Design a protein around this ligand. Structure first.
Ligand SMILES: Nc1c(C(=O)N[C@@H](CC(=O)O)C(=O)O)ncn1[C@@H]1O[C@H](COP(=O)(O)O)[C@@H](O)[C@H]1O
Ligand SMILES: Nc1c(C(=O)O)ncn1[C@@H]1O[C@H](COP(=O)(O)O)[C@@H](O)[C@H]1O
Ligand SMILES: Nc1c(C(=O)O)ncn1[C@@H]1O[C@H](COP(=O)(O)O)[C@@H](O)[C@H]1O
Ligand SMILES: Nc1c(C(=O)O)ncn1[C@@H]1O[C@H](COP(=O)(O)O)[C@@H](O)[C@H]1O
Ligand SMILES: Nc1c(C(=O)O)ncn1[C@@H]1O[C@H](COP(=O)(O)O)[C@@H](O)[C@H]1O
Lengths: 419, 419, 212
């Protein structure tokens, strides 16, 4: 592990070059806590390890969801390796609940006002003037350029949208711990190699407000330190316990709270290719997916026996019925299970206009849905599992963001042919 | 309460008439535990209240799911009021896991063998001959008549199917308490007023096998007592704690473990009646349902603001988009939420063949499903919530049974007009 | 407001001319007064139409008249005069072209709406023989509408002819065309977007009560 020159030095972390690794850096956390732009600063033993653990869990969580993030791997108790970025000097805040500086800048608004959707604000990084709020108009007018990327309307719109998606994913991920994510701050950078804007710096207990059971008086974040009238060593021990409480629970955000399974039932092996597309698409959402062959018309006894094997082992299941021509498979399955059934018929333009009505017009007492896209049927099945599984939900949420970013990037490209 | 004469007298309960309430009876539990046709017996203080508590919670659970059950209400610590029935003298056993007598009657099968679907057996009630197993053929040949109902193929088929559904519902209900329901016995009667076959007698800790974490050595049920080499006053206190363990937790089967919500979004108040049908049908599954008016075409900013209010409050939600003509509401919603979206367009035969295709043929990245039936919409939404909510699951499962019973009853009616 | 002639700030005609005076002199107040007078001398011209607009609805049969009255009424809501005429492309194509020419020839910008049931030849023949826009608004019914509409939609090359099924829609489309060159029409379309949106807000506020 061949460390090079000190590239940047902050109040709680240092970034070093790696002579062994082109375009990667090491972020070393420090045993230091700070607040405000006066002399609130303190040595706190174990803080480097707590900070590094939290940002390492959180970045792994966001990266595995599909959020583009400056994170390679954890690297000992107190550092992590990241792709080298040029930092954008903006603090991006997202709020679910109005507290803190939102109340100061908006007198009359009360503690607890809820933002639907979550509110995004920008602060320019400058300690000298205590990080003043900026409009999007101010950020665009600054004509910032980092690793050769000019930060214009498109880039500002992307960091704004991503800030909201990242908040939403962290908010959903803390929920199973009975913790309310109130707000957070993040920073983005331009990856010097890819030129992509990515989540960067760190996310740790300085980055957010976390209320157990949504109770402010139980705050576990750095606000406990900000709020001390006087820093005593008894005060610093409470703040340390709060950091430890977060650190003891953060790894559980990477844990699945619910098992998920899709079972694709096909009436014929000639539909196998259509079924492989559903299975592959389920893999993108981290949902195990099984293929089976059964015909409602030639083997209805066996259809019900197979159904029962999946009903009976306790694993929450979505069935996808793939039957061409007169689809009896979705209907018979739909009528005989309390679990959801999705018909995804392998329609073609020859007879598809005729065949689809066998999936759509069903007798009463049948919940059976229809999704024509095979990738769509997996996505629908993911949306069902996302109601009870934060990891699936997070991949769906990040996927909304990434698709939207792709449109922005494609419109930016085509906009050039208009000059 | 005005008690009359004793009607039945068993080793663990007594049934009295109620002169005040025609066609209702009082089942009084007794402080006795028994094993092997009253060859082993014991006074156990509190067993009457434990038995009555469990059967009262379980019958309320099954009754609110939609299972036809001889239960009116609890009536103090040690009794319950029921509709008067003529008992069918059959023990209906259902097994998920082979243990007990299934192993003795099937040498070579090993403890733990799983049944998909759950295995149903019949035993004739007879102390004298140790309750011998009967075939369905034997029961049909018995030509039993109770409250004037001849018990033929239809009635035997109904009890067999109902036994499996009741087992499944109890099995699903115990899962959230980390308890494996291994097997159970139940009895049916004929309601002397309605003439309907109904679940009757009691379901208590003598009715089933319950393994915490699926571990046999942590047995909580009456098997703990049956197995004892010698019945000591120290052995009877352990059996007592097992009954108390069940008694504490049984009330939790009535607790909803997850919040559920449908939001029906309609592009026009002219679609309101169609939306009322979806809402009514959500009520049948115990799922709160909100109606909102928003147009993706005339107010897309507001569609997204409304979406955000329901995304943002933590309550798991399914959106139903009701848009006639060119449905843009389902697509825009589907594209902008990780939660499931169902299009349930208010199709009519005038233009419905043409309008449906706006719900069905979606760009990539959209999981939006289509359910034409408004009652079906709600059912599909129930099926999604049933993956995470045992109360919703159980209403869906009982509904499969009851629908199937209605078909049997209608076939028996029309079969008469063939003579 | 702030009003810049030719988008030039130094030509500001609004109260900013008064806000910006270092010192109020009576020479300064006379300039400010001239600016107010300049606005006042021009403001009445915002009520003036800068362009004439006309819709001509051509119907192949008097049995479609009710459908045509709906278009005409809807044109009135946008302040656009609307004329009804009876002509058949199939039984009187000479007359279709003569009528077309009367409206082409008097200088008034015109949108034609062709209303023909069954096999609509009226929109196509009109579309092919005028540089002005033509909109087919066929009086479709659920009996044969699925079959009849394709006669409006699949046209030979060199035909610009559009299709709008709603009769109120066809007037609205015609208004949107005139709104490119007439600020009064544009303004009614813009206000109508607002009012419709407000109606949705009000209807959602009402229905939201049944959820409590
Ligand atoms: N990370 C930071 C910072 C921050 O960088 N603070 C330093 C001061 C400084 O370095 O200048 C400190 O006092 O901790 N301030 C707020 N937040 C977070 O951003 C969201 C907005 O908080 P608000 O704007 O309401 O203070 C909440 O989650 C804060 O934890
Ligand atoms: N196509 C089927 C099937 C089936 O295929 O099993 N069962 C009923 N149906 C038909 O659906 C319509 C609605 O009937 P219900 O909603 O009352 O079941 C009827 O015309 C029936 O024959
Ligand atoms: N409740 C009773 C009685 C009885 O009434 O004696 N016999 C069996 N059972 C229950 O039925 C299931 C099958 O038991 P076996 O395996 O002994 O046939 C078990 O849940 C048992 O508690
Ligand atoms: N298809 C859509 C959309 C949309 O997609 O935004 N908004 C309303 N509608 C539907 O069009 C019909 C006419 O309704 P209105 O003309 O009153 O808007 C209704 O059935 C409505 O749901
Ligand atoms: N239906 C009509 C008429 C007409 O009706 O006058 N004129 C050409 N067409 C047909 O449209 C297709 C495209 O032809 P063009 O686009 O080259 O005119 C041809 O098959 C033609 O006969």
């Amino acid at each position: 592990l061949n460390i090079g020159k000190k590239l940047y030095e902050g109040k709680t972390k240092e970034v070093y070059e790696l002579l062994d690794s082109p375009g990667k850096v090491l972020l070393q956390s420090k045993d230091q806590i700070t607040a405000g732009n006066a002399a609130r600063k303190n040595h706190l033993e174990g803080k480097a390890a707590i900070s590094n653990k939290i940002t390492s869990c959180i970045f792994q969580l966001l990266q595995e969801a599909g959020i583009k993030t400056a994170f390679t791997r954890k690297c000992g108790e107190t550092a992590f390796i990241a792709p080298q970025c040029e930092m954008i000097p903006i603090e991006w805040v997202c709020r679910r609940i109005a507290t803190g500086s939102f109340l100061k800048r908006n007198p009359g608004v009360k503690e607890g006002y809820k933002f639907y959707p979550p509110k995004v604000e920008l602060f320019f990084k400058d300690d000298a003037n205590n990080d003043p709020q900026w409009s999007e108009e101010q950020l665009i007018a600054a004509k910032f350029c980092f690793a050769g990327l000019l930060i214009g309307q498109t880039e500002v719109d992307i960091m704004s949208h991503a800030t909201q998606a990242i908040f939403e994913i962290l908010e959903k991920s803390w929920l199973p711990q009975n913790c309310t994510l109130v707000d957070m701050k993040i920073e983005f950078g331009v990856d010097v190699t890819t030129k992509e804007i990515v989540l960067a710096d760190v996310i740790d207990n300085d980055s957010w407000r976390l209320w157990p059971s949504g109770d402010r008086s139980q705050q576990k974040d750095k606000q406990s330190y900000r709020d001390l009238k006087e820093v005593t060593p008894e005060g610093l021990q409470m703040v340390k316990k709060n950091f430890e409480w977060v650190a003891e629970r953060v790894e559980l955000l990477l844990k699945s709270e619910s098992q998920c399974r899709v079972v694709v039932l096909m009436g014929s092996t000639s539909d196998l290719g259509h079924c492989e597309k559903i299975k592959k698409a389920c893999g993108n959402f981290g949902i195990p997916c099984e293929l089976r062959v059964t015909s409602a018309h030639k083997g209805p006894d066996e259809t019900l026996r197979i159904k029962a094997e999946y009903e009976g082992d306790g694993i929450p299941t979505v069935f996808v019925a793939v039957a061409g021509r007169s689809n009896g498979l979705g209907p018979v399955m739909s009528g005989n299970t309390a679990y959801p059934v999705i018909s995804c018929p392998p329609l073609t333009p020859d007879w598809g206009v005729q065949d689809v009505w066998s999936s759509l017009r069903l007798p009463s007492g049948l919940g059976c849905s229809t999704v024509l896209s095979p990738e769509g049927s997996a996505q629908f099945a993911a949306q069902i599992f996302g109601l009870s599984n934060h990891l699936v939900w997070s991949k769906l949420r990040a996927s909304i963001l990434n698709t939207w970013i792709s449109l922005k990037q494609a419109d930016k490209k085509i906009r050039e042919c208009n000059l």
